[PDB]
Amino acid sequence: AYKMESRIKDISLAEFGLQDMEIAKTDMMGLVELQRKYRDSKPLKGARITGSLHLTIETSVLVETLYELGAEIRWCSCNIYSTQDHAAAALVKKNIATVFAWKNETIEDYWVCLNDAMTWRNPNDKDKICGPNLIVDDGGDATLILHEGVKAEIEYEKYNKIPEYLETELDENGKQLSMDLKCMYKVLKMELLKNPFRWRGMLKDLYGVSEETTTGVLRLKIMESEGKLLLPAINVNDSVTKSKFDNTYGCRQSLLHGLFNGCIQMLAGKKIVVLGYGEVGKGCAQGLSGVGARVIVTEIDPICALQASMEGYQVSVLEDVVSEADIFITATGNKDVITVEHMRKMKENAYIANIGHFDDEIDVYGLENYPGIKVIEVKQNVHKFTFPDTQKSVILLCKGRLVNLGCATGHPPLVMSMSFTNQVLAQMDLWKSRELVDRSKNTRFFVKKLSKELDEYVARLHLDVLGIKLTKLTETQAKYINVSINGPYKSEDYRY
Amino acid sequence: MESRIKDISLAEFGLQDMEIAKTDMMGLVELQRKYRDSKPLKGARITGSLHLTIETSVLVETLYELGAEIRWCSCNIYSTQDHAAAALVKKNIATVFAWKNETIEDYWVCLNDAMTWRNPNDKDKICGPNLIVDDGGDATLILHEGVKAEIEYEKYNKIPEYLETELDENGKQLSMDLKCMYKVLKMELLKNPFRWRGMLKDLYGVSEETTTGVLRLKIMESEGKLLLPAINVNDSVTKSKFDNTYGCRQSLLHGLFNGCIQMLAGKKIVVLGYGEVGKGCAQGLSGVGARVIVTEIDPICALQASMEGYQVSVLEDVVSEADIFITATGNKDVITVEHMRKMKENAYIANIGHFDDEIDVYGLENYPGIKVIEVKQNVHKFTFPDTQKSVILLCKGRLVNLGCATGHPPLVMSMSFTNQVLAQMDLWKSRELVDRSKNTRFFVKKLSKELDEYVARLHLDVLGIKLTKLTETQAKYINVSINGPYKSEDYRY
Amino acid sequence: MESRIKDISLAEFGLQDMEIAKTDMMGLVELQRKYRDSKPLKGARITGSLHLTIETSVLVETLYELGAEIRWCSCNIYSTQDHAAAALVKKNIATVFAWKNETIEDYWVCLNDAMTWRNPNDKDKICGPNLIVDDGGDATLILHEGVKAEIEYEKYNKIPEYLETELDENGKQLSMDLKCMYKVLKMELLKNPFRWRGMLKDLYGVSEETTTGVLRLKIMESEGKLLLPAINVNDSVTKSKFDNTYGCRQSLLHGLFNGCIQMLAGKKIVVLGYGEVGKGCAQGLSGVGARVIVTEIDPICALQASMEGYQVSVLEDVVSEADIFITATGNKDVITVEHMRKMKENAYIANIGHFDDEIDVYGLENYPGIKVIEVKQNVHKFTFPDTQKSVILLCKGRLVNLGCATGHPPLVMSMSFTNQVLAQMDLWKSRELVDRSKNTRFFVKKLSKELDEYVARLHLDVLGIKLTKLTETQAKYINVSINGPYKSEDYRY
Amino acid sequence: YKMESRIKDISLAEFGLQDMEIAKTDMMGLVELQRKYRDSKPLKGARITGSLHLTIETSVLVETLYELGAEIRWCSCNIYSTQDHAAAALVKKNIATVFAWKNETIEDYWVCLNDAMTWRNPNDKDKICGPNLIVDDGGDATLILHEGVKAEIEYEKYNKIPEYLETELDENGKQLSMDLKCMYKVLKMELLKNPFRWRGMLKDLYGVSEETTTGVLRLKIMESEGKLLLPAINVNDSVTKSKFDNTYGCRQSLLHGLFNGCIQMLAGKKIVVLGYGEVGKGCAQGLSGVGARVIVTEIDPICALQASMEGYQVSVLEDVVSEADIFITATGNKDVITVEHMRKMKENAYIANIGHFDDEIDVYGLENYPGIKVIEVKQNVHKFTFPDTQKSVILLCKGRLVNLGCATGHPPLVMSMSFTNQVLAQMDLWKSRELVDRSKNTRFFVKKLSKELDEYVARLHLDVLGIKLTKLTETQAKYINVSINGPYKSEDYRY
Ligand SMILES: NC(=O)c1ccc[n+]([C@@H]2O[C@H](COP(=O)([O-])OP(=O)(O)OC[C@H]3O[C@@H](n4cnc5c(N)ncnc54)[C@H](O)[C@@H]3O)[C@@H](O)[C@H]2O)c1
Ligand SMILES: Nc1ncnc2c1ncn2CC[C@H](O)C(=O)O
Numbered sequence A: 001a002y003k004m005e006s007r008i009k010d011i012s013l014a015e016f017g018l019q020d021m022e023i024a025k026t027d028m029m030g031l032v033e034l035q036r037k038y039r040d041s042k043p044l045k046g047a048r049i050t051g052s053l054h055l056t057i058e059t060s061v062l063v064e065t066l067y068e069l070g071a072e073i074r075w076c077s078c079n080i081y082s083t084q085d086h087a088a089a090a091l092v093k094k095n096i097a098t099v100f101a102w103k104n105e106t107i108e109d110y111w112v113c114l115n116d117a118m119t120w121r122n123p124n125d126k127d128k129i130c131g132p133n134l135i136v137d138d139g140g141d142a143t144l145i146l147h148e149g150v151k152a153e154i155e156y157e158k159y160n161k162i163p164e165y166l167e168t169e170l171d172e173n174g175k176q177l178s179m180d181l182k183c184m185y186k187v188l189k190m191e192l193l194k195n196p197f198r199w200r201g202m203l204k205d206l207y208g209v210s211e212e213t214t215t216g217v218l219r220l221k222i223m224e225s226e227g228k229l230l231l232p233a234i235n236v237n238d239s240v241t242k243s244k245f246d247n248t249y250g251c252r253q254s255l256l257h258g259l260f261n262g263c264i265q266m267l268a269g270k271k272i273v274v275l276g277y278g279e280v281g282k283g284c285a286q287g288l289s290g291v292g293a294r295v296i297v298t299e300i301d302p303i304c305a306l307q308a309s310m311e312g313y314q315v316s317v318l319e320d321v322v323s324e325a326d327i328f329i330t331a332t333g334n335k336d337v338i339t340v341e342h343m344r345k346m347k348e349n350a351y352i353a354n355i356g357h358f359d360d361e362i363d364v365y366g367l368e369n370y371p372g373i374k375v376i377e378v379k380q381n382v383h384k385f386t387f388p389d390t391q392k393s394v395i396l397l398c399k400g401r402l403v404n405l406g407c408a409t410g411h412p413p414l415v416m417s418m419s420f421t422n423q424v425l426a427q428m429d430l431w432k433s434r435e436l437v438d439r440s441k442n443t444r445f446f447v448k449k450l451s452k453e454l455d456e457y458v459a460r461l462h463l464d465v466l467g468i469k470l471t472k473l474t475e476t477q478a479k480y481i482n483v484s485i486n487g488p489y490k491s492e493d494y495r496y
Numbered sequence B, C: 001m002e003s004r005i006k007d008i009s010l011a012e013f014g015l016q017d018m019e020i021a022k023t024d025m026m027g028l029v030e031l032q033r034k035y036r037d038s039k040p041l042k043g044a045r046i047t048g049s050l051h052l053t054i055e056t057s058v059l060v061e062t063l064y065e066l067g068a069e070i071r072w073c074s075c076n077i078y079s080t081q082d083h084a085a086a087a088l089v090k091k092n093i094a095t096v097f098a099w100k101n102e103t104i105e106d107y108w109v110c111l112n113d114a115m116t117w118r119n120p121n122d123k124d125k126i127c128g129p130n131l132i133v134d135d136g137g138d139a140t141l142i143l144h145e146g147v148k149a150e151i152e153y154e155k156y157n158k159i160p161e162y163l164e165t166e167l168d169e170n171g172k173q174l175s176m177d178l179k180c181m182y183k184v185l186k187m188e189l190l191k192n193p194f195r196w197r198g199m200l201k202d203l204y205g206v207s208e209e210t211t212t213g214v215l216r217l218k219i220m221e222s223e224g225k226l227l228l229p230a231i232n233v234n235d236s237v238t239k240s241k242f243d244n245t246y247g248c249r250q251s252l253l254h255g256l257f258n259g260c261i262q263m264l265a266g267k268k269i270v271v272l273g274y275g276e277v278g279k280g281c282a283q284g285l286s287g288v289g290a291r292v293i294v295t296e297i298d299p300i301c302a303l304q305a306s307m308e309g310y311q312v313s314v315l316e317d318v319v320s321e322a323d324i325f326i327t328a329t330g331n332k333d334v335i336t337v338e339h340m341r342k343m344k345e346n347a348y349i350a351n352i353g354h355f356d357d358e359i360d361v362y363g364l365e366n367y368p369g370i371k372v373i374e375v376k377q378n379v380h381k382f383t384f385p386d387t388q389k390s391v392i393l394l395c396k397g398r399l400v401n402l403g404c405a406t407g408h409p410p411l412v413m414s415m416s417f418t419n420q421v422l423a424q425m426d427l428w429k430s431r432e433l434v435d436r437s438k439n440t441r442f443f444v445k446k447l448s449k450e451l452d453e454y455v456a457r458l459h460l461d462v463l464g465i466k467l468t469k470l471t472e473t474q475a476k477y478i479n480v481s482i483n484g485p486y487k488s489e490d491y492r493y
Numbered sequence D: 001y002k003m004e005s006r007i008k009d010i011s012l013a014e015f016g017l018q019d020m021e022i023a024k025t026d027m028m029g030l031v032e033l034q035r036k037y038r039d040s041k042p043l044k045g046a047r048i049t050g051s052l053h054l055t056i057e058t059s060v061l062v063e064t065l066y067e068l069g070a071e072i073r074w075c076s077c078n079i080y081s082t083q084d085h086a087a088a089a090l091v092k093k094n095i096a097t098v099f100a101w102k103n104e105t106i107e108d109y110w111v112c113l114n115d116a117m118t119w120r121n122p123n124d125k126d127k128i129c130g131p132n133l134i135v136d137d138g139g140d141a142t143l144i145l146h147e148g149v150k151a152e153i154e155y156e157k158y159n160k161i162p163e164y165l166e167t168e169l170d171e172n173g174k175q176l177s178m179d180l181k182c183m184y185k186v187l188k189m190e191l192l193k194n195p196f197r198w199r200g201m202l203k204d205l206y207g208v209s210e211e212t213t214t215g216v217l218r219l220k221i222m223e224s225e226g227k228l229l230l231p232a233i234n235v236n237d238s239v240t241k242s243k244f245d246n247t248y249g250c251r252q253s254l255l256h257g258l259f260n261g262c263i264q265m266l267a268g269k270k271i272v273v274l275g276y277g278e279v280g281k282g283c284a285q286g287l288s289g290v291g292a293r294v295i296v297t298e299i300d301p302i303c304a305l306q307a308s309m310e311g312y313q314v315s316v317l318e319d320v321v322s323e324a325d326i327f328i329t330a331t332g333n334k335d336v337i338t339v340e341h342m343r344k345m346k347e348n349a350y351i352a353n354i355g356h357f358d359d360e361i362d363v364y365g366l367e368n369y370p371g372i373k374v375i376e377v378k379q380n381v382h383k384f385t386f387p388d389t390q391k392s393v394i395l396l397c398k399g400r401l402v403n404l405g406c407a408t409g410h411p412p413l414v415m416s417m418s419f420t421n422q423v424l425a426q427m428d429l430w431k432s433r434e435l436v437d438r439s440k441n442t443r444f445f446v447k448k449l450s451k452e453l454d455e456y457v458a459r460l461h462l463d464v465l466g467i468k469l470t471k472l473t474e475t476q477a478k479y480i481n482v483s484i485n486g487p488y489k490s491e492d493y494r495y
């Protein structure tokens, strides 16, 4: 059932995956505790969960936790390069989940895999096609294919034909659509022809989505302000134990791993430009400085720019340092941060990489299609592009995809356990409140966050890993600072 | 002879990494530009025993462009980058005996093969190298032990019984490296017992790369047993204060990130030895949030660690609570099987020193009832049967930055190897001064500060460094020449 | 397992009746409409021991639509309606072990089978239910007596003596229900002596339907021996004040009309017990002209009967003159063999309490030389040899409304069963809060007044009830919320 | 006896005899008559044909007539009211020759009645004759006799089978009821066997005693038109019959009929009782007894006010047809509930009749409505669904008297009171037989039993319920102007 239906690279790699999961668990005490505490009561019993999140060894422990808490699971990765095949094999081999993921997927297969993960069959009702009850999303692709599907079906009924926007290679104003959109549209057209009520049919049983990253939250917020969000949502990224640990300390280590694997050069003494000084950019700069690099920051936000200056970093606009810098790292969550025109001005063998969720930060398409460009594969997922006029080259790590997961194996278990403990709590919250979702009356959905009580709980579960000894307030002390001995200890607007 | 590498087809990826790497190896690039026409090393036979990385192939390419004939092998069983080896053979730069994941027996055969040259006058007769590039002293050791073997072979006119026994002087099992070296020596005594002493007539010197190899040279020098001139490359300022410190700062982290799946942040990481290597390791580990705890025998180095805010303890007081252990002492028996049994569940262990001796890997592997599983390529989890607790060892205790990663980056290696080429050029030009006819003793010397500063000058443009020029009056005030040297001989930088 | 019922071909009749019944079971209809998609009981395994009537079939259907997997049996040998059981099996709504006119032996086997679940992981292993819907407490009893048996079994490493004997502690013959339960318990000790205790880990609660079952839960709670959380459904206002009262007002009459051919008008009919059931019985009997005489032990209840114009006497003073006797006490030995021997020729006897213990049927059946004839299905005339006098007993003293008729009608059962579904949802939603690690003590609780009023709201439309709404000023004056609850916790309605 | 009888199953006999003995504990009037007259046998030699629901209670009536010396033939007066174990008991003991079973077709009903009226000549094997006396309930036995006589006169007048017997329509061109077509089918058949059959029975017919209101109505109509062909006794209007059986009997048996046929709770429901006469009064009382909200319909202003005095709403069917839950007809009239009323009722409304005939409800109109879907809910209970509205109504036992169609009728006590009147009426008719002159006058009347006998029936049942009657002193008897032994009330007293 699980092996037949799953689509993975190689099932024989399962044991390596299982051994790694067990080693990782020494530090993932949040997930370990959740399994110990809830594997019998099963708070997610009966829930069909579709996950779209980089299928790493850390993610396998997340999936395992969901499974032990009673859920059935279908999973895919949210990036073509991030899957670790031995982690994927472990899940399939142990019948923990039906998996559709492998390292180095074509963009076409990426969308087929996501759609496959969203496609369920109900054994209690003639194996009728249905959707998930809950979604674990990272970047919003699962949430996007649902909403774009609903949109495609409404447009389909309106004129009783395939929408024209799904059959063209151009967008609203003559520009070539990204390959990801063309590949998603190809799947949406394929599903309209099979059943044009598919996506709307899924809304009946869908009780929520828990989003992992900043870019996904951005997408959720935009839908919410337009009144187009079709299901409840929990913003996992903005938990303190997520955004202030994963985004920061996780990248501090994983960026370096990615650069070490993709870039052969010494980082020490190099001028490295970190574009964006947010939670991710802060961790990146700290890591880079930690190994002797001279970090130059770019920012649009005056507060973040000043914070960078307070840490001793030069803050410049890209145009003033593009011709002189050695390495460029985008961490903005924005688009067109590094253009082809910027690339043409870079010094010989300047390295370029992105750590934001999507490749849009760098004009990778513009570079690959530059007339007369020459490309060489330096190593797996590292390419050198040479311009014909100047004969100068630039080296791009993993086609602009998040470098820590494209050129390395992402953040280590400890911080992923903090992030994933929030995910499990979010999934439990959405499932346990499923009765309160009413579509025949309200229809308007919102984005929320987990309570500070839970947020603090995530931190408590990981203290023993590092031998942290916490102090306990006396009754008189608690009253003095106006808090309960058991927390929460900070006001809702506290920034840590 | 015919090169022995893993796969010749990897050559293009190797040549391509060499060209990228050269963007930063301006020392070697300059030496090639300046000396490729005059070829100051023309006619020289050079045998090298040094981790065959991409950075090393640029060193080999540089020795080749300067006119030397070359034979090479790696000085560790796991440090060879196969594509780098392939690039060298593909362009006939050198005859190579190297591949990643060699057995100890094959390591010694490769080395022996790299030292074997054929007579440029005759054909059927054998000879040795003129110059040696060594890292750790293994090429130098086999030469000396070979001579020592041939001498005692003639005296008692039979195979010396220490080459046939597996136990040492104290009845304890010899290391696999010694047994495999002794196996090779026995074979050469039967094939030709004048081989090692035959090489002495044409040996003009050795240039040693690392602290541990220099230690071996100094011991042979004090006993009056050194058989050729030697240049200590490790102790150039542009080698010891850059490669050992800043190179490890980045390469230890690379090795740990590849071998150890866990987060270093917040972990109590013990760095055993706070010398040039240890200092760099500590700095890197701190750079990614680790809590570094240092062990030392030298009260000066211990105070230095404390001045950078590090706790300084004895291993026995922290072995049960620490998370990761990193040996950087260049000593032996620093981590014992008894230390390992007291470690917490899934504690990580690794060595960055030149030899595996720092950790008792043999005692671990041969512990009664031990259970071992391969976590990934060159990472093993050992589980003790009495406690059911496990420890994870990176690459069987071999230098972790080259066993689980690709070693230091090109910039610092270019500085280290620029010193190697200059040392080779020095030994070669001074060959007439080596007089064998009268048993004169040989010595260990270092490169001049003039050349040491030169190495630094050649790499300033890589990082956009702008040097200030002294005025004539300023130069006089501090009593130096405008062109250097700028510091007295005992300056520590 | 495969269901064990009388006849699957009766399914269509059952399905039609269920559909007609739903016209009045608007509590269950609404729960299905509102929760069939979200499924608040999804994945829960529910075992039910409750008279399998058409009304119960709609309860089961409701639990199923809300997501549970279900196994069901009846809590009386005569109460199952075969067409109701067939409907459930035909539609795959539940696995059923029930049929009308079961032997006492088959009754305990059916209950035991209903409690047995195939483990979804290891198809070759057994497990128990997560939740239990009980009526009278036999499911709860067999579980607790099972645990007791296994503990006593390991304590002396042999089958406990009390399970292998036909006598009770005082040498008196055990009731057939106990002998048959014990038979099953001995059979399970030999198969798997960890069965019952193994079920506890996944047991989150029991919701109890009737007064007698609640008494049993209350005794276990005070002794500290209750093994799972419990919800007392009987004592919801929308249950005890409707089903027990008005349900019996109609179903007692239906039972009597089917079993007793004689006219009720003018007869002296003794109603033993004037509680919630007796009150309804008395009202129905006098509604068709009978002269009701009440017996009571409670002075308050006795006064209430007197206030409704009924004579209140002790059984002895009227046993020789009364025509019909109806027990509604929930007690035992209310009608003894000696009472029966003093009754007039052709006196009728029936019980409406949960268990047959109210009448000494065993003593009657085993009276020496007693003659018995079957008047009709489940109606027997016993003739004493010494007096030649006869008494006519309805369905061997089993609850007459369900033994000689089809029990209460759908409207009140919907009110009772809507309470059952809410209790099950409550127990399932808070399953994570149950813990057996800390070795905790379990309790009996009741549903809130908010939910109790909601049950009533769900049934107002059935009868065209137009409810008045409080103004904001009125609500403040009587100190309540416009949306209720409207009465304090101790309010008696 | 066992030779001719047509019943379902003789093996049910033991259960029937056993129920008879249990029933007799309360049927003290019948037990007393048997004890007083089994030796003198006042009905000795009388041939009695009965058409009255063959229940256990009726078996006791037949046993009583048999003990009193009569030869008996019996059938039921409804296709669903027979209890098979009761019929079997009579056949096994040779008490009577029986033609009756539960769930007869309408064709079989009339054949059974015709067979119960046919007697073999006591002085000849070959020839056939009629009964001496008739015990009738609803008037069907009486009807077939008169219609038979009418059909014989018509047959001889035009020397051919009367054309109203061959067609299946009435004067208006409307389809005849199935009971009329099947009766005519039998009357046509008998003209071809013996066209003097019915007139030949007159010679020996000494009278009929009628049980129910509807049968009496039929008798009163024949009497007023000068067409009654034999003396008749109105049993329905004895005080110990109409004020007990009709009222208290239905109070219990309507409920038993409803509880068996209708799965729903009666409490709180709006239940319409159409007709508030002796039957309706008892019905309303029983329904209220179990919490129903009774709504009464009436054409009689006196009866309507009576219902209002007991707290019942009085409405016209049209004003409540859309909101009521259950409808019970107790009028003895026709077309009280039409198809159009049925089409307006709420989803799953229940409909039933307790009057003697199904005519009160347009059952034929419902069954033949175009596109109607019908399903059997249980034995004798059907759900009918309309195609345009998709709404349904559930009819109990095709509109036949519900207490006997869906249950087993009144209990023994009141039936004993009704049947003690029947036995007394049979004795009176038989004892006065020589006062019937067929040669002289063909002017027959309907009379009732005297108040003395009426009070006697009540006396015979007082001990069943431990009733203690007070005795008048001589001075008290003179003061209220009655005899110490009754009668105690004037003839017009209404009780
Ligand atoms: N047949 C049904 O459908 C049905 C429905 C509901 C409840 N029940 C059962 O009916 C029984 C009574 O239920 P209830 O809710 O009326 O209980 P209750 O406690 O309200 O009433 C029982 C009454 O019996 C009286 N009593 C006890 N022992 C007596 C004795 N020896 N003599 C006289 N009176 C005595 C008590 O004083 C009490 O008032 C229980 O067994 C219950 O489970 C049956
Ligand atoms: N990249 C490297 N190539 C060759 N040798 C390397 C590299 N990184 C570290 N080493 C080890 C040499 C170093 O100078 C030492 O002394 O051990």
Ligand SMILES: [Cl-]
Residues within 6 Å of the ligand: A043, A431, A432, C040, C428, C429
């Ligand atoms: Cl839940």
